[PDB]
Amino acid sequence: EFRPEMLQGKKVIVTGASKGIGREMAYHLAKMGAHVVVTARSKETLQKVVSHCLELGAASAHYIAGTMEDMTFAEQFVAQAGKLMGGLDMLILNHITNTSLNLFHDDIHHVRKSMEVNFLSYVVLTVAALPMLKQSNGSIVVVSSLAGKVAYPLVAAYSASKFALDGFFSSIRKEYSVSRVNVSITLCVLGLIDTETAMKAVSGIVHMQAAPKEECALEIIKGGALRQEEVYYDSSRWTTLLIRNPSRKILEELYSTS
Amino acid sequence: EFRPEMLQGKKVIVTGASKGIGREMAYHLAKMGAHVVVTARSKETLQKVVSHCLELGAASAHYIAGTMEDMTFAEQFVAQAGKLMGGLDMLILNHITNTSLNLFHDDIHHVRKSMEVNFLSYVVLTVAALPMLKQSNGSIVVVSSLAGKVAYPLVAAYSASKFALDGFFSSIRKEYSVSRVNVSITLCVLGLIDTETAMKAVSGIVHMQAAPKEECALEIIKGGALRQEEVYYDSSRWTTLLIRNPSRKILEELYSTSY
Ligand SMILES: NC(=O)c1ccc[n+]([C@@H]2O[C@H](COP(=O)([O-])OP(=O)(O)OC[C@H]3O[C@@H](n4cnc5c(N)ncnc54)[C@H](OP(=O)(O)O)[C@@H]3O)[C@@H](O)[C@H]2O)c1
Ligand SMILES: NC(=O)c1ccc[n+]([C@@H]2O[C@H](COP(=O)([O-])OP(=O)(O)OC[C@H]3O[C@@H](n4cnc5c(N)ncnc54)[C@H](OP(=O)(O)O)[C@@H]3O)[C@@H](O)[C@H]2O)c1
Ligand SMILES: Cc1cc(C)n2ncc(C(=O)N[C@@H]3[C@@H]4C[C@@H]5C[C@H]3C[C@@](O)(C5)C4)c2n1
Ligand SMILES: Cc1cc(C)n2ncc(C(=O)N[C@@H]3[C@@H]4C[C@@H]5C[C@H]3C[C@@](O)(C5)C4)c2n1
């Protein structure tokens, strides 16, 4: 049902686009047409992405560098991004603070940092984007993980932040339905992706199974365009069938009665 | 399988005990002849609880007042609590920052406050309690909600923090199994409870028939004692069957088997 024609000329923001899925998403959006603004901390890397985007045939490519640790930047960004494009119709939140597979000892600093960058930031951005997105009847795309739906050891603070996204975004989605706010909330559940970051991170655990970033990225955009509630992407059909929870849907609708 | 005899003489912390489920938990534990350390911000209210606890037959009852907004408070708390009891056999994290049913507009302050009090605090406490709990082979009891497992409008920041607890605690539970840390992590998923706070928050908004706090409270403690992963408590059997996530448990175990 998806068409690349849909995205042509649309005002898109991609966070965490200097590398990983973000970069391939910016690259995918840079085809036929689309106005794409990218953000990450890496100044030069972002400029490089910006250039290849235009070479791939993007309607307009712009970067704004900075940390999502600082919340005021996060607001400032959406404003400038919204100024460069005039409007904004799709916000793709996909950045995360650096995480390594490791046993949780006592790094409360890391739990807080994870909370700030992988969660709070997305909320701050959404709030900042909401006026602009309301008038375009746009979409918020939150990039989550299997760990955002299930418990894995060695990713406690990462899981905590990815579970918080579902908690929050799944709930404001319910609010937007009742309050009739015509803005889409697409939550993306991913398994291992063949990104360099993941590849560096994965040792002991295999590693060989990790899915292609190219397909993954396009699948996120597709879901966003099609205004889906969830996007499941994994190297396994089995994990994909197993991730879906009917019981939750039934419970959520069961209270929607009154 | 549970027995009140189990709790007799055990050193227990109950956060958010000046009222609500916390207070009934302190009250049941009191009746069971355990040592109780209670915390909340309300100085006098806590003293009141402390007294009735001893009258109910608690082995010891002590209150340490303070905000879980401030993280240094949270560490200092566990130290003194530990000092008063000598050790710690069960940590019951049950406090929350005040929440009102409301549409999420742009209160980032509230999202952050919710995150700090309902989540970060619990982690800070757990970390602070972990050395004392390790040597007693104790239990951490995290009090979550239906909204900690499912999406409801008017509770976005509340759900965000309760979903973060599952995320975090469910994961360190997996870690403790592999790393062989003999400390239990009990997550309690609750529906509406007949607490005055709830009753008020929900009186004008859609009321859905709340369950008794007395039974709820005891059910949390039971689960903790029995060292259960999850505790389900609702006014409905229907919601109780519907909350359980079999697919998740199968997927989590399906990786466990492999690694
Ligand atoms: N690949 C997988 O195995 C996997 C699995 C599940 C979910 N996902 C999700 O996929 C998304 C993309 O992950 P990835 O594999 O592409 O990882 P990646 O290569 O680590 O990309 C992370 C992005 O976030 C940026 N970033 C990091 N810290 C930041 C900060 N404080 N401020 C601003 N930007 C920051 C990075 O740029 P700078 O370093 O330039 O700041 C980069 O562009 C993430 O949301 C991740 O949770 C991936
Ligand atoms: N009842 C329900 O409908 C329901 C449903 C699902 C889950 N739950 C969970 O059940 C548990 C019990 O909640 P409840 O609603 O029954 O009790 P409640 O009356 O809302 O109790 C809140 C407790 O936390 C304390 N507290 C509030 N703000 C604080 C702060 N910033 N710092 C430190 N302590 C603070 C309060 O004392 P002060 O005001 O004296 O400081 C009080 O002792 C919570 O974890 C709640 O999430 C309840
Ligand atoms: C190991 C593993 C296995 C499976 C099946 N999944 N499914 C999703 C994830 C996931 O979210 N991975 C994250 C973790 C690990 C890597 C890659 C990525 C960013 C990072 O910082 C470093 C934290 C996952 N991890
Ligand atoms: C809307 C709704 C629907 C269902 C089915 N449930 N099931 C559990 C809760 C829940 O935990 N809500 C919280 C909120 C609102 C009240 C009650 C409780 C503590 C409080 O402080 C005050 C914040 C709930 N809410």
Side-chain angles (χ1 to χ4, degrees), chain B residues 86-103:
Chain B
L88 168 67
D89 316 320
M90 192 177 275
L91 176 77
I92 305 165
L93 315 159
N94 140 114
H95 66 273
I96 46 166
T97 176
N98 314 335
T99 296
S100 98
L101 293 174
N102 235 119
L103 274 198

Side-chain angles (χ1 to χ4, degrees), chain A residues 78-252:
Chain A
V78 181
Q80 295 184 284
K83 275 154 203 171
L84 299 171
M85 309 204 275
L88 149 79
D89 40 62
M90 192 178 272
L91 177 75
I92 307 162
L93 316 158
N94 142 289
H95 63 275
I96 46 165
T97 175
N98 320 330
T99 296
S100 96
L101 295 174
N102 234 121
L103 274 201
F104 178 85
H105 305 300
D106 62 319
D107 203 349
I108 297 160
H109 283 327
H110 177 70
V111 200
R112 173 141 52 219
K113 185 137 155 199
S114 301
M115 233 38 185
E116 293 270 300
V117 184
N118 324 341
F119 172 69
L120 231 108
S121 170
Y122 284 43
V123 175
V124 180
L125 286 160
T126 305
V127 171
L130 237 93
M132 194 159 261
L133 276 170
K134 257 154 180 170
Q135 73 160 23
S136 55
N137 271 194
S139 299
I140 300 142
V141 176
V142 178
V143 178
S144 192
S145 146
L146 224 43
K149 294 290 187 162
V150 126
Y152 294 133
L154 313 177
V155 273
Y158 178 86
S159 270
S161 71
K162 295 284 172 195
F163 264 63
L165 291 171
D166 187 358
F168 189 82
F169 284 100
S170 290
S171 174
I172 63 109
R173 216 203 276 97
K174 300 261 156 197
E175 284 186 0
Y176 291 2
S177 165
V178 328
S179 64
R180 283 256 198 169
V181 170
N182 245 84
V183 165
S184 132
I185 291 97
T186 316
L187 192 66
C188 292
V189 179
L190 311 177
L192 227 67
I193 310 305
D194 71 354
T195 74
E196 210 188 288
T197 304
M199 292 318 111
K200 278 179 263 171
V202 302
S203 27
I205 41 98
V206 235
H207 145 86
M208 277 270 270
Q209 195 57 327
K213 51 206 193 280
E214 299 74 30
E215 188 173 39
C216 169
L218 185 69
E219 282 290 319
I220 291 147
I221 300 144
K222 285 195 246 184
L226 295 148
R227 297 171 85 90
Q228 296 181 28
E229 249 192 31
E230 246 125 75
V231 164
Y232 299 133
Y233 191 93
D234 194 62
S235 349
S236 189
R237 162 184 160 98
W238 300 343
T239 89
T240 283
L241 309 127
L242 260 173
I243 193 70
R244 331 151 35 261
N245 186 39
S247 281
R248 137 117 88 127
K249 200 89 303 293
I250 303 188
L251 238 185
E252 282 171 331

